[PDB]
Amino acid sequence: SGMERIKELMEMVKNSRMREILTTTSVDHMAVIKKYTSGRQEKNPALRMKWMMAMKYPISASSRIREMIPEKDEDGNTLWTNTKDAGSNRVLVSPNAVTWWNRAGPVSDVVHYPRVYKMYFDRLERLTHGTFGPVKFYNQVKVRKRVDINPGHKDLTSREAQEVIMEVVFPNEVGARTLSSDAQLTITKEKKEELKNCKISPIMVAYMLERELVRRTRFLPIAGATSSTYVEVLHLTQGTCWEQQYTPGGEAENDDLDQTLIIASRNIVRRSIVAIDPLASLLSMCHTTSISSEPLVEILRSNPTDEQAVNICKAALGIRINSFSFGGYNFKRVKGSSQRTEKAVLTGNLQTLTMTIFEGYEEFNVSGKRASAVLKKGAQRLIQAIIGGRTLEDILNLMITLMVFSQEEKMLKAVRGDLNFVNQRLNPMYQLLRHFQKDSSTLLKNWGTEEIDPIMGIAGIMPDGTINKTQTLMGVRLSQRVNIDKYLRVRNEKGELLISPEEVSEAQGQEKLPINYNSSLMWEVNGPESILTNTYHWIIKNWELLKTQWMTDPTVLYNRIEFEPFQTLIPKGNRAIYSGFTRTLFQQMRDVEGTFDSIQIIKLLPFSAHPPSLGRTQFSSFTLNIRGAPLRLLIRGNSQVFNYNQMENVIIVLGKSVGSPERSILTESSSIESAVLRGFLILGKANSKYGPVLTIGELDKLGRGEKANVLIGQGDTVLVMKRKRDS
Amino acid sequence: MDVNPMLIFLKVPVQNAISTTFPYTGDPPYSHGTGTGYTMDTVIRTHDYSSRGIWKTNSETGAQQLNPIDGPLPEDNEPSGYAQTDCVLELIEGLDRSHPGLFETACQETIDAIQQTRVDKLTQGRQTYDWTLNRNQPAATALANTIEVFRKNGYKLNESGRLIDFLKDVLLSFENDSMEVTTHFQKKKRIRDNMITQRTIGKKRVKLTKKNYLIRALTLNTMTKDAERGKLKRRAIATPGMQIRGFVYFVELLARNICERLEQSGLPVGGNEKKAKLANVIKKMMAKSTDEELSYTITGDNTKWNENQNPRIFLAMVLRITAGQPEWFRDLLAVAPIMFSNKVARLGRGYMFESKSMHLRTQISAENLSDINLRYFNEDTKKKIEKIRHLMVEGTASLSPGMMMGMFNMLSTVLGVSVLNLGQREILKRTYWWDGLQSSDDFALIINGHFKEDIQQGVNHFYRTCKLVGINMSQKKSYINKTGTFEFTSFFYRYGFVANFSMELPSFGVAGNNESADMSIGTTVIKTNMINNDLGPATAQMAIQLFIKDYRYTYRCHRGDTNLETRRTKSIKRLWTETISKAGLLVADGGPNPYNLRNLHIPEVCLKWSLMDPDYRGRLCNPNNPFVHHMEVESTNLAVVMPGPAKSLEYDAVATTHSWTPKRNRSILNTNQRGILEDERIYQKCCQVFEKFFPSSTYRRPIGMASMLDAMLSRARIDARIDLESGRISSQDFSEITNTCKAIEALK
Amino acid sequence: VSSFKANGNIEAKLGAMSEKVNAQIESFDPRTIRELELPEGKFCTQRSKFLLMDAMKLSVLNPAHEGEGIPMKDAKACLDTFWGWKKATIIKKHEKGVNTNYLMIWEQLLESIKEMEGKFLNLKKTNHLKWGLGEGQAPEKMDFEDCKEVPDLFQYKSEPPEKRKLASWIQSEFNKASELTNSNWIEFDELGNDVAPIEHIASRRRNFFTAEVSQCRASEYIMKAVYINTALLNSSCTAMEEYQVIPIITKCRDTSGQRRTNLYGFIIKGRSHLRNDTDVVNFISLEFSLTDPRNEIHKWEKYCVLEIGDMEIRTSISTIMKPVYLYVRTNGTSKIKMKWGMEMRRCLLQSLQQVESMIEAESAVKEKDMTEPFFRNRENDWPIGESPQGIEKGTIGKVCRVLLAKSVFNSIYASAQLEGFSAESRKLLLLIQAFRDNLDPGTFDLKGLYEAIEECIINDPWVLLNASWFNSFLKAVQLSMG
RNA sequence: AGUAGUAACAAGAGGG
RNA sequence: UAUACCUCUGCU
């Protein structure tokens, strides 16, 4: 009707008290006067509530309550009073009112409320259909990282959501904006369909939608999976010393799967590379590994990702790496690879298209309808295209198709006008094609011309369509089974190298979904901090065993396969010289009796597991590639990596205790320190009587037996002697 | 044997057993009576630190203004306020140099902000000093009063509906020498009874002088800070006025956008992020160093941070940061530093005297501290009077130098940050160098070099370089050691950040919003602490267990099968026996606790939904219930919490009959402000009806410059028409509605 | 400002600035540094709201829940379990008090209990009670004009607190607080059923905690605190003008699981028009005891101690009769004070957090749930005491009770002194820890910190005891190191 | 008295 | 001047 509101409005406007306000205060001011109250924010609500709950009538409720419920309940409890709430036409009420309502008030239909409160009920939904595994106990290193908080966030910006809300809950009173996308429209119609005739305060729907649509992030300490659905349950999933393995209800997300697969495959490859028979070491890990409780094999079988490690794994498991099609033609990549960068770029009419640009040298066999070509592509570059066809037209068509496919600046710069090609609006790659097919007039004027050397069979094409022997369009020329070896090199049938484990990058971010290796080659915990802590733990747990093994038969010790995961953290070329340097430093400790630094042995030992080189280069520290940034373990003394704390009697690796060594080692010292410098013994504090102090780079002009002062590290000047014998 | 819990520290490192040093399970300290003594102590000490500076009388005000900036350099370690404008400008420039196009974007954002900012955005936030009433009031009222007074005098640009048009008026209002305000007072009529005296409130117009209004608009209020942990003696906090708020908002809004893009700025980010920045700086400070270099961290506190932070320096900062931008914007932001540099401080409630022989007590207004015999007071107090009297203006006390806690933020940090950003190898080019993190008085500074003396040099250099901009490191409380262990704002880094759970203990309990909210908060407190502060499973379980016990007792909502005797237990028993599926009843209706580690993130209603009696849930969630009062989206499911100053807390809950509000304070009924309740009661009934014509008003604030009635009518037509035309209404009803719509519009 | 450019100002100004402005690092060494200076004066008195180790219960067997039944009926029921009463006589005087008024109060109360029916018990406003509950002792408020010219009108006494000296008793009280009893004091509400393994683990670990904690004497203080403070807040809010009686009750279970109601004494609440969160309710505490005050008379300054009866007790070999004392006193509290007393159970969290973190800390490195080892595989390995033999290592179960007692005492004796002391001494502890980690600690103004700490040690038994503990710790560290 | 602790409470305001 | 009542208020 809209009747009683104008009756009410008349009945108000009669009263000059308020007819004053309604006339005087504007719509901008009504917001200022709505929040006008005598009441302050309560300073101590916990106290105030404990105070008020002992009173008879502490709750305030709408006066209509006096119509809706009785004054005295069955037991003689007074439910409401006539005393009105300071600053309101509201009544003071007993808690017994709330109970009486809940046991014998009016009933309502609320059965669709879960559609309003979806955001909450999905939490329950994920939990009820979650599954737990076992609890594992270990040093749980957590990265403080910004992460998502709002699983089921249909990702759109605040006002973009606001429009969608306003549409759904406030349809007549909508503002004045366009519904940008099917992103908005589908959500609007679906949520409008879902929330159809639900008896609830619109405000609550607006609130719940506002909470439901927009992304929300937080800085959290996280070990393991960083997906929203895993962030939802950190409190249940991880502790200080424990991991409660858990998979939450419902299905994983392709982006997260594809993202994590790369990191898995990378770590598999980077591990395998170190082991003997890397192919065999890989294959077992690929068979045993499971992502988010799903087989890596059955992922890789039916997952389309193109990455070097993933491709090494696909080649090893014997599944076709990836050919494809575009613009009518079928492309098959023969050589090279490319990394994918999503970007925004401007056409010649300054229109912003959002590409997924490819960077890298690639070679393609392109074929199809009446025309074939070989393509050589660089990052936004057509290096060379050799095109053949049954008609000049069919050539030219493929030429335009490739010239598009290059993603060159030239061709974007070339686009005059806007691109509104379609009711499905095609992606920019196609927009550009279906543009230039309809008009390549400018494209060829701007593409440019080479002079070239005339060859029998080959010919050049000119921007006007002419064929020319010695001139051609930039890069264009007209002319009429995989295997993998022991060490993970990917060869083609001809014997040429496609993919190399030397070319595979480090694992970049942090896993989205959880990775579960069931492989003795890998440690129980994921990541590098794990590797360091476990590698230094195993040593301490089996110290006494390995201490004799150090004395008697070292060359066996150094080949301990438990040291392999540690090697992945060392950079490729350093391992040999590091292990040699280490081994020499140990040998010095054997050759020079008396000196014996169990902690120094424990510290450096894991670097020893590689075939050493004969170089005589000095090292104050060893680098370790952990989570991107290089960490430098100092050879002399404590570090951010390895820190022996005597107060605790504990080795501390990256902030976490790895164990207590034998109390024997606290009371253990000697003035001479072996196992620091190569052919050089340390003999205590630096004495000025051996001249001005030297550096580590200036220790190849000293006599065998000559004492000299050295700035050894961490601002310490030390007395150093060159030893006589050569280890 | 005698037990000594500290002996644990023999075996366990301090940081690992730090909880045992945090006694946060007992009532904190609370000031009783006034904080005039503290305010005067602050005002005194503040001048005492700047005593060497230049004294001058303000022409417009007549306040004894001390200026220390660019004054004589200090020749001892004591707290000094002698900052140097060139030495500031050098750092503030060095910052611009160090962050290419920071200030450009920072300003560019603040411009669009200033352009787009409504007046409404000032009704949000903390309580403000209301120059109209000479008392603190909530922002929404304190503004509304100033707008109403501005409207009653000749000032109505703000009627536009944009913050800068209000912000304008404030500067023009300084011109009007005779400012008209309406004061309220109690009178007493004589009434008959079918004859007794009857109290009643009446109004009285008063006109204030340039002198007065200018003082009142430069007045900041003072209080004692209560519930303050870690400290033996109480401190004086301050509250800003309704004028300066609008400028402070934009200065802080710039300084925020400045801070947000600085690795050394602690503000405005949360602890997890602060810790990430503190990681980043260490990781970087190691990754940049060489294997023959030392690394020393300073655990750092800055003594007398506010007392020695000058507003003229803020004028320099805010100017230099805006340099190159539009001079209107350059001016607008410069207002707050000026207005602060001419700040006067109220001296609070005053004092209370007691006669032992007569057995009587009396109150004294701080305003009376000019004309009062000193025989009543003691030495320390009467001497503080002696000292304050020379600075005392129309009830208030002049405070040109320094600052006071609670008025201004963030920018003060940028001054610190810039002194950190000075310490890059690429700027210093010495044998030593530095970096760190700072927020307000608290700082962590990593100094790197080749040798201990080389570090010492950088310590001295830093320490003096701060003194030159009026920053005073606390030699007492700050300390230094090799990089590895440090303290920062009660975070403890020991080769990595450890746990400090004790800090959060006060958060564990019944927050006292209501049955609905408290249950959602309590669980989330347990949940977030498990994640953030190493609260283990078994203890968390026990926190659930105790929370339930506290919640049940507090709200008198014990389980329906208990024999306890309260005002509810019968009516809860009725419901308990009546109910078929008991597990569905909420704890607040005497149902069982459903929570354990896995459930903590799931709201009680949501968690118990399937198990409820469909009658009972239909009553529980009945949107027609009178216990709830309909909120707005911006304030739906929100509470208030104090960690920092004071912050809002969102929580997850389903709107039930347990989502009520408790009774309001009634003490105002006895006061002369008794009308404000009626004002509120009326004001609400207008918006309540308006919302029927604009349901959209409760989700988004309706932007419009038009009479609130006219908007209601203009719609009331077209709704009444379209309900018929392309709908289901009778033209007799349409004609009746339009006849009403005209009939009321006839009435003025 | 616009046309400013940095030529080289700061360095010039630093050049100009005096060399007295320096941050000179004095390198820190715990072997060098002295003990904290404890204050001297009269010995510190007990200032709790109820008796600790010197409390005495009249108990009855009662199968009721742990907050059920009419508390006065439960009290009456307990009263009857004591046979041999007497005529009351004052044996230790309240030096500043009208010691008759206490003796009249006890009898008034004790008769008023015998002559009541129903739930509510309000005493009648007799002068001797009025005096003890501070009736009328607020001066009458006046306008300043009307009392400008009075001679002795001053501002209220605003001096710092009188210094006091560390008596032994507090360490004793703590030593008892730190012990097990033969009764379950804490009764935890129900939880959601366990599903996740970690929940089962959690409960497994929680059982041990509950075992070590629920019997601990600290927990008996927690329950007394909670009951007293809830009762007092509620009665303060509901009966503002009455003198309500509140019997000091707790409910427990024996080692048999047999349920028992205890009566420690009575509280007579004053008037309670509590407006500000600091406003005071005066009350009278009347509490049973076997302890003779006169053997430690400094401990009981504020109390008037009566002798009220006798009873028999058996030792190991012998068996003898002892007299029963009633410790009577006027005390006070505030909305904020009792609000926090209601919440004392959070101590359990403070205690158990630290332990669970210690268990988990090992569990991580051992790679295994180290709970059942820690509790069951009993090894005394955490230093928690000092005897004439030397440093005394205890077990995790002991550490629980110690930490619990600490956390409880922090709640019972909360004070700005503790607040400051705790905040500042932490820095000195961290300075020690930095040396003991060999991180070369340096300080700028140490004696400033020593004075900042020492400033907060005035008259609080708990803060004095903590200051002492810090010294014992410092010495204990110095010895092992030097 | 007692609470308390750098200043208050030990009811305040009104029917004057 | 005293004694009785009665009203409002318990963060304003």
Ligand SMILES: C[n+]1cn([C@@H]2O[C@H](COP(=O)(O)OP(=O)(O)OP(=O)(O)O)[C@@H](O)[C@H]2O)c2nc(N)[nH]c(=O)c21
């Ligand atoms: C420009 N370019 C396009 N493709 C592939 O060509 C096909 C059609 O290109 P498209 O742009 O229509 O692909 P899609 O809509 O799947 O979005 P995209 O995968 O993000 O591009 C897809 O299979 C692309 O991966 C490409 N493949 C390789 N190897 N190198 C390239 O430079 C390149």
Ligand SMILES: [Zn+2]
């Ligand atoms: Zn209960």
